[PDB]
Amino acid sequence: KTRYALKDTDEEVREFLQNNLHLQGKVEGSPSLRWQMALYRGLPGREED
Amino acid sequence: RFFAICGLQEGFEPFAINMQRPVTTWFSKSLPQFEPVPPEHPHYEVARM
Numbered sequence: 001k002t003r004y005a006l007k008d009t010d011e012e013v014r015e016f017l018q019n020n021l022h023l024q025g026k027v028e029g030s031p032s033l034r035w036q037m038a039l040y041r042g043l044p045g046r047e048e049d
Numbered sequence: 050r051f052f053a054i055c056g057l058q059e060g061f062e063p064f065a066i067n068m069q070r071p072v073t074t075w076f077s078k079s080l081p082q083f084e085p086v087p088p089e090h091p092h093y094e095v096a097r098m
Binding site for chain 2 (some may be wrong): 035039
């Protein structure tokens with residue numbers, strides 16, 4: 001969303017996300033993500049692939 | 050039963066999401082009791098002579 005605020009096209013944000021894939025949150029470091037991830041993974045059609 | 054349908058994606062959390070014991074609840078008991086007359090009671094005033 002910050003990159004879109006800087007007037008970037010859909011290609012610029014994608015390559016920005018490609019080089020920043022390691023900044024996604026960790027479940028252990030956040031208590032909120034603990035139950036959200038458990039609830040998210042309980043959906044029928046969720047595949048780890 | 051409906052948190053995922055409406056409320057989960059909007060950023061709302063359950064009121065007791067991370068709590069060990071059930072939330073303590075208080076109820077209005079309809080047993081008359083004697084209590085001191087409030088100093089700011091709209092209708093009743095007590096003067097110490």
